[PDB]
Design a protein around this ligand. Structure first.
Ligand SMILES: CC[C@H]1OC(=O)/C=C/[C@H](C)[C@@H](O[C@@H]2O[C@H](C)C[C@H](N(C)C)[C@H]2O)[C@@H](C)C[C@@H](C)C(=O)/C=C/[C@H]2O[C@@H]2[C@@H]1CO[C@@H]1O[C@H](C)[C@@H](O)[C@@H](OC)[C@H]1OC
Ligand SMILES: [Ca+2]
Ligand SMILES: [Ca+2]
Ligand SMILES: [Ca+2]
Ligand SMILES: [K+]
Ligand SMILES: [Mg+2]
Ligand SMILES: [Mg+2]
Ligand SMILES: [Mg+2]
Ligand SMILES: [Mg+2]
Ligand SMILES: [Mg+2]
Ligand SMILES: [Mg+2]
Ligand SMILES: [Mg+2]
Ligand SMILES: [Mg+2]
Ligand SMILES: [Mg+2]
Ligand SMILES: [Mg+2]
Ligand SMILES: [Mg+2]
Ligand SMILES: [Mg+2]
Ligand SMILES: [Mg+2]
Ligand SMILES: [Mg+2]
Ligand SMILES: [Mg+2]
Ligand SMILES: [Mg+2]
Ligand SMILES: [Mg+2]
Ligand SMILES: [Mg+2]
Ligand SMILES: [Mg+2]
Ligand SMILES: [Mg+2]
Ligand SMILES: [Mg+2]
Ligand SMILES: [Mg+2]
Ligand SMILES: [Mg+2]
Ligand SMILES: [Mg+2]
Ligand SMILES: [Mg+2]
Ligand SMILES: [Mg+2]
Ligand SMILES: [Mg+2]
Ligand SMILES: [Mg+2]
Ligand SMILES: [Mg+2]
Ligand SMILES: [Mg+2]
Ligand SMILES: [Mg+2]
Ligand SMILES: [Mg+2]
Ligand SMILES: [Mg+2]
Ligand SMILES: [Mg+2]
Ligand SMILES: [Mg+2]
Ligand SMILES: [Mg+2]
Ligand SMILES: [Mg+2]
Ligand SMILES: [Mg+2]
Ligand SMILES: [Mg+2]
Ligand SMILES: [Mg+2]
Ligand SMILES: [Mg+2]
Ligand SMILES: [Mg+2]
Ligand SMILES: [Mg+2]
Ligand SMILES: [Mg+2]
Ligand SMILES: [Mg+2]
Ligand SMILES: [Mg+2]
Ligand SMILES: [Mg+2]
Ligand SMILES: [Mg+2]
Ligand SMILES: [Mg+2]
Ligand SMILES: [Mg+2]
Ligand SMILES: [Mg+2]
Ligand SMILES: [Mg+2]
Ligand SMILES: [Mg+2]
Ligand SMILES: [Mg+2]
Ligand SMILES: [Mg+2]
Ligand SMILES: [Mg+2]
Ligand SMILES: [Mg+2]
Ligand SMILES: [Mg+2]
Ligand SMILES: [Mg+2]
Ligand SMILES: [Mg+2]
Ligand SMILES: [Mg+2]
Ligand SMILES: [Mg+2]
Ligand SMILES: [Mg+2]
Ligand SMILES: [Mg+2]
Ligand SMILES: [Mg+2]
Ligand SMILES: [Mg+2]
Ligand SMILES: [Mg+2]
Ligand SMILES: [Mg+2]
Ligand SMILES: [Mg+2]
Ligand SMILES: [Mg+2]
Ligand SMILES: [Mg+2]
Ligand SMILES: [Mg+2]
Ligand SMILES: [Mg+2]
Ligand SMILES: [Mg+2]
Ligand SMILES: [Mg+2]
Ligand SMILES: [Mg+2]
Ligand SMILES: [Mg+2]
Ligand SMILES: [Mg+2]
Ligand SMILES: [Mg+2]
Ligand SMILES: [Mg+2]
Ligand SMILES: [Mg+2]
Ligand SMILES: [Mg+2]
Ligand SMILES: [Mg+2]
Ligand SMILES: [Mg+2]
Ligand SMILES: [Mg+2]
Ligand SMILES: [Mg+2]
Ligand SMILES: [Mg+2]
Lengths: 134, 118, 206, 57, 115
RNA sequence: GAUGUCGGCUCGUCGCAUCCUGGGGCUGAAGAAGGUCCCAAGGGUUGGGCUGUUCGCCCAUUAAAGCGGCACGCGAGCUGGGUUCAGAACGUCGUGAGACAGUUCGGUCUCUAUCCGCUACGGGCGCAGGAGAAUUGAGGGGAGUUGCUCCUAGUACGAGAGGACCGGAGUGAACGGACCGCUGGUCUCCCUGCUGUCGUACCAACGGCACAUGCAGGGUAGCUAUGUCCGGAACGGAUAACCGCUGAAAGCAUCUAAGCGGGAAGCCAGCCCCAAGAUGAGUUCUCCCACUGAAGGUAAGACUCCCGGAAGACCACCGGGUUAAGAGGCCAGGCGUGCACGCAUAGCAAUGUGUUCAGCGGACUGGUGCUCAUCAGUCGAGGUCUUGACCA
RNA sequence: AUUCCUUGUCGGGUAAGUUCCGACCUGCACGAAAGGCGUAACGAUCUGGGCGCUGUCUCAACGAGGGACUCGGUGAAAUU
RNA sequence: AAGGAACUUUGCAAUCUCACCCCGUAACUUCGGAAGAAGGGGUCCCCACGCUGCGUGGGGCGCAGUGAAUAGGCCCAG
């Protein structure tokens, strides 16, 4: 449950370190890079959901500067996330990893763990930079 | 309504012992939940989760425990149904001395010296 | 066509091939075939059928004659199923299978007189910026002179719940045949202990 | 604001509200022990019985 | 709505509906029977009835549990030493209600609660 | 002798000159993507910055971000930013008092619904005897949105780049119904911790007040969403624009002049809910019978009264009422809190340890005749006539 | 607080700024005790932004108490 | 719950902060002030030691020690 205005933390070494949401999309990877669409009224981002976001606060030196409109994917909800077995996960803090219109990450590494759902949701290479799934 | 004379809980208990699994006694010790991640292809990966246990909940096929770890500098909790087929088994790293049944207060202590006893 | 009656026992957790699946448990107890109604005699095709047993001191003489006509120890409840033309009596076992979709009808747990925010999802008013009707209340109800009235079928505070409700296409997780139990994926309308009618899917979903 | 009634009500129309103000007679019963007067599932007020004496009177 | 709540507001707040039932329980045990509104008697029953099952314990713990609801040391000794031992045969039927007439100031049906 | 004004909010409902989706003709229509006209009003039509704004510009998305009507819909429904009462200021006009549809800061929006309309719920009578139950469905309401991906298929088409219709499968969004197993919320006294003070003579141990819980920490049932399950349909019939078959008025040609087939998110039906006050009052099963003198005792059956209820403002509805487990208590179990009091021990003590997975206990599952459902009263049939048939 | 045209033009802040800050000046219609420009401190003054925190909101829920409901007692009003 | 002004004319309302001790505090200034700037730390119980209820130390319990009540939200710019 991310919605616009909600700041997130950034899980990558691309220069940004603090993005504010600005839009919640409903698209994903689909053989031509990112799909468009899903409708235009979905109101909460879950892990594995793409969002758009302004880059409020960024590290000097580094590939993404403040004010940049950006398409991150969220990797860490404080909101709980449930599995088909019945397992639940929750992380203490909300965080996302900025990407580009192929879905590839923009930094050279991910920081902290990432939800296993990104593997379902086909972000095959953000999972690769990730120290742990779960 | 429909006032059949019947023991309701007994009928619930009887379609539920078949989905109940008993675990080693713990309270909030420390724990290795050696578990299963078959989401990795058609093959079965194994992973393990080790942290302080902060809650027991429910009864019968509804029992769950809440463990709480810190991976890579970011606090994480997780909730395991005892009779989940993705919980292979559980064992106690080390017993802890505590005065509650919950430990929610541990969430905002989040630091090395703010740690469960013995 | 196929149907039977039962009581709503409760809702628990259960695994099937390693995926948790909430289930409502229903007692689909044996159902005697009381009255049997043909179009040739009664102008339409259906079968009457009964459920909770009832001690005969508690029974009307006319109802005793109705059950005695067929030869059935009297039951507290009776219902009809159109098109269902069985033979013998109606056990849970024989007429359902693992994995049929089936419609599940029951009587909604009833919630009294409710406001428009609960009964109909109204927005209700701002809770600040000075405004009595600080929530809860319906707003405008009409236009003005040249509609002249308020609309029929309008939406306003009323008796919410306590209604008949079908739920389409619930899945049959398990049949424990001998005990007359039946597990069913998801949530049947009603309350524990209540009457429920399990029936074929009304829609032949492809 | 301030709703107020529009015309006076007719004697006919007001009396047919009151169509429902009829008091229900108590269903009284005869005390098997005292002389008479008793209200059901209650003590007999005169003698005090409710199978023997209860209240003092 | 209230699909399974038990208990009564007695057009009274939390602090009072206890200090009622404590004060009424003290009088029933101090008097054997009392006469009160039919409703307060219906709520008074299970509280006093549980309270004397506490005293059927005999030991000091049960005495001090009774003491935290009943602050008159005499009635405490009466229930603890006189009545509860008298009832130690008695699977819980320790109270009955009769309901008397109907009063005249407010027209409220009233009733007896006795042992 | 008063029809309250802009804008916002809240509720909707209607037109179609259709923004999306659906079906068609022509195209300077290869495909793909479009243009434009015809039919189509079922449903859908996003969140934000600036401004009182309506409009409009921008942000970021969308299938789409339609136009209007309903006193420029809606102030006995709410605001009160704009404006249009007194104060005050600037600019400008006026010698002045004062002044403009110029700006600017401030500035009382009136507890009780009588009738109709509307949402829910009863009472009466009616429905040619008095009753307990099961129902047909006249008729009426609800619902109706859409994307993305995959197979067909890198196929038809196209120099290439690109790249389909048709048919089939999967997964969402928003909406809605139900539900509480799951994840959480709350659970005003169910459990525990804590401070000041007052009390139970003192110690120990407890109670009150500090909120209408003193504060904190958890929390069962219930209720609840952000939580979960299900849905929108498939098939059919008649159609719109349109597409065709047989074919004349004209030995040609023509979808038409008789006639006939196809053809939409629309119409009717199918899905869910109400429904015989459908006064046209329907059908079926079962019961009580033919009493006495419009009545009165009674049958079948109900009600009144009590004890309760996942029913509920009241009524109504369901269950139990001694041939009784209905509710409470009591027993056992669950679940919640988290190891009681007392005693012993260790320590100068604060405290620690043991006895003790202890103690305590709302609403949960059963069992149990300890409590109360005692006694009893009040109602409630004798069935109109006419015509037809069939047996008397 | 004066500017009609006007959301003047550039820049700042914002993802986006008719508001606001800074320049510019073409001042409809500033201007020197109806005082002109400045000023630290002061302000229940007015205007714009930021941090913190929040049921203000997405989008409402559950709980409490006082009314609203029921019964016994007393029993109005505007209006017609 | 997750979110945190997305509400709105306006953060209006309602949070937040809160008392005393210690450390530390900017532009700018009429050299007084801005200033309680901002910020960070302490707060209970026992014992021993020094001093005139403090202080130094050691130990103890709780999620928490102005343990409940009274008792600032702050900053930049006009
Ligand atoms: C807020 C409550 C008070 O309502 C008003 O102020 C004004 C109400 C209405 C709306 C308005 O009518 C409107 O007029 C417009 C010009 C036209 C309009 N359209 C229909 C076209 C019409 O709607 C009035 C001018 C007309 C009339 C009734 C009247 O003059 C009323 C006088 C006031 O008493 C009342 C009320 C009592 O509250 C008072 O409040 C004070 C502060 C307290 O001290 C109280 O005790 C002393 C009490 O003082 C009396
Ligand atoms: Ca009325
Ligand atoms: Ca009254
Ligand atoms: Ca929170
Ligand atoms: K439960
Ligand atoms: Mg039972
Ligand atoms: Mg602890
Ligand atoms: Mg209810
Ligand atoms: Mg609201
Ligand atoms: Mg009219
Ligand atoms: Mg008005
Ligand atoms: Mg009262
Ligand atoms: Mg006496
Ligand atoms: Mg006991
Ligand atoms: Mg108690
Ligand atoms: Mg007039
Ligand atoms: Mg008027
Ligand atoms: Mg005007
Ligand atoms: Mg048209
Ligand atoms: Mg088209
Ligand atoms: Mg094309
Ligand atoms: Mg918009
Ligand atoms: Mg409109
Ligand atoms: Mg006009
Ligand atoms: Mg208007
Ligand atoms: Mg009006
Ligand atoms: Mg104003
Ligand atoms: Mg002049
Ligand atoms: Mg003011
Ligand atoms: Mg004002
Ligand atoms: Mg009011
Ligand atoms: Mg009032
Ligand atoms: Mg007839
Ligand atoms: Mg009849
Ligand atoms: Mg019909
Ligand atoms: Mg009609
Ligand atoms: Mg192939
Ligand atoms: Mg292929
Ligand atoms: Mg080719
Ligand atoms: Mg297709
Ligand atoms: Mg939903
Ligand atoms: Mg709903
Ligand atoms: Mg819960
Ligand atoms: Mg308490
Ligand atoms: Mg003491
Ligand atoms: Mg104590
Ligand atoms: Mg006192
Ligand atoms: Mg006092
Ligand atoms: Mg307080
Ligand atoms: Mg609490
Ligand atoms: Mg032809
Ligand atoms: Mg045709
Ligand atoms: Mg056809
Ligand atoms: Mg069709
Ligand atoms: Mg469709
Ligand atoms: Mg008739
Ligand atoms: Mg008669
Ligand atoms: Mg009888
Ligand atoms: Mg009843
Ligand atoms: Mg009964
Ligand atoms: Mg008896
Ligand atoms: Mg028995
Ligand atoms: Mg127990
Ligand atoms: Mg010692
Ligand atoms: Mg019980
Ligand atoms: Mg201007
Ligand atoms: Mg800029
Ligand atoms: Mg600008
Ligand atoms: Mg604004
Ligand atoms: Mg303004
Ligand atoms: Mg300027
Ligand atoms: Mg001047
Ligand atoms: Mg001058
Ligand atoms: Mg001056
Ligand atoms: Mg100046
Ligand atoms: Mg002043
Ligand atoms: Mg400000
Ligand atoms: Mg802003
Ligand atoms: Mg409520
Ligand atoms: Mg009087
Ligand atoms: Mg008068
Ligand atoms: Mg924040
Ligand atoms: Mg807005
Ligand atoms: Mg805003
Ligand atoms: Mg203002
Ligand atoms: Mg304020
Ligand atoms: Mg200096
Ligand atoms: Mg200085
Ligand atoms: Mg200042
Ligand atoms: Mg500690
Ligand atoms: Mg501390
Ligand atoms: Mg305090």
């Amino acid at each position: 449950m991310i919605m616009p205005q909600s700041r997130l933390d950034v899980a990558d070494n691309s220069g940004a370190r603090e993005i504010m949401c600005i839009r919640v999309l409903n698209s994903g990877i689909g053989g031509k890079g990112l799909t468009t669409g899903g409708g235009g009224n979905k109101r909460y981002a879950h892990v594995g959901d793409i969002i758009v976001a302004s880059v409020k606060d960024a590290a000097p030196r580094g590939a993404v500067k403040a004010g940049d409109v950006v398409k991150a994917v969220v990797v860490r909800t404080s909101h709980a996330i449930k599995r088909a077995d019945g397992s639940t996960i929750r992380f203490d803090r909300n965080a996302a990893v900025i990407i580009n219109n192929q879905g590839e990450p923009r930094g050279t590494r991910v920081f902290g763990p990432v939800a296993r759902e990104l593997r379902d949701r086909r972000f095959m290479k953000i999972v690769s930079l990730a120290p742990e799934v779960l | 309504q429909t006032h059949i004379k019947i023991n309701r809980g007994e009928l619930l208990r009887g379609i539920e012992q078949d989905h109940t699994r008993q675990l080693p006694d713990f309270r909030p010790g420390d724990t290795v939940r050696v578990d299963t991640k078959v989401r990795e292809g058609n093959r079965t990966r194994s992973q393990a989760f080790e942290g302080v246990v902060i809650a027991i909940n429910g009864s019968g096929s509804r029992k769950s425990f809440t463990v709480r770890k810190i991976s890579f500098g970011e606090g994480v909790e997780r909730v395991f149904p005892f009779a989940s087929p993705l919980v292979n088994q559980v064992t106690i790293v080390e017993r802890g001395k505590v005065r509650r049944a919950k430990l929610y207060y541990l969430r905002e202590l989040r630091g090395k010296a703010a740690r469960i006893k013995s | 066509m196929k149907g039977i009656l039962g009581t709503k026992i409760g809702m628990t957790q259960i695994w099937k091939n390693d995926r948790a699946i909430p289930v409502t448990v229903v007692l689909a107890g044996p159902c005697p075939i009381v009255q049997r109604k043909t179009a040739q005699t009664d102008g339409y095709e259906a079968v009457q059928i009964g459920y909770a047993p009832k001690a005969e001191r508690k029974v009307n003489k006319p109802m005793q004659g109705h059950f005695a006509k067929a030869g059935v120890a009297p039951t507290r409840i009776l219902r009809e199923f159109r098109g269902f033309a069985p033979d013998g009596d109606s056990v849970n076992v024989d007429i359902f299978a693992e994995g049929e979709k089936i419609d599940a009808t029951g009587t909604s747990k009833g919630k009294g007189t409710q406001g428009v925010m609960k009964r109909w999802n109204f927005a209700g008013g701002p809770a600040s910026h000075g405004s009595k009707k600080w929530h809860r209340r319906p707003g405008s109800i009409g236009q003005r002179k040249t509609p002249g009235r308020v609309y029929k079928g309008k939406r306003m505070a009323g008796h919410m719940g306590m209604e008949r409700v079908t739920v389409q296409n619930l899945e049959v997780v398990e049949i424990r045949a001998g005990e007359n139990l039946i597990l069913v994926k998801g949530a049947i309308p009603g309350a524990n202990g209540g009457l429920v009618v399990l029936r074929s899917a009304a829609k032949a979903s492809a | 604001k301030h709703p107020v009634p529009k015309k006076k009500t007719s004697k006919s129309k007001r009396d047919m509200r009151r169509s429902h103000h009829a008091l229900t007679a108590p269903n009284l019963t005869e005390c098997p022990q005292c002389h008479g007067k008793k209200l059901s599932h209650h003590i007999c007020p005169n003698c005090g019985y409710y199978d023997g004496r209860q209240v003092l009177a | 709505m209230r699909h399974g709540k038990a208990g009564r507001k007695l057009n009274r707040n939390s602090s009072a509906r206890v200090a009622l039932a404590r004060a009424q329980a003290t009088a029933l045990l101090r008097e054997g029977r009392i006469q009160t509104t039919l409703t307060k008697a219906k709520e008074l029953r299970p509280f006093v009835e549980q309270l004397i099952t506490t005293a059927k314990g005999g030991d000091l713990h049960s005495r001090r549990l009774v003491a935290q609801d009943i602050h008159d040391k005499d009635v405490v000794r009466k229930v603890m030493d006189e009545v509860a031992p008298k009832y130690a045969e008695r699977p819980g039927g320790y109270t009955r209600i009769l309901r008397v007439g109907t009063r005249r100031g407010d027209g409220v049906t009233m009733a007896l609660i006795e042992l």
